Structures are given as C-alpha cells and as structure tokens.
C-alpha cells in the first residue's frame, strides 16, 4: 500500500500517509 511515490518508506508528513500508514 503506497501514498504516492514520494522517497521512502517512514517520511513523517509527506512520504508518511499510506506508505508507512
């Protein structure tokens, strides 16, 4: 389950919302 493609896996606000979430 991904966001979007930001960078990485934990990205507190950004790379954070359905990556690591």
Known sequence: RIHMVYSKRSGKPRGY????Y
């Open 17 to 20: 919302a359905f990556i690591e």
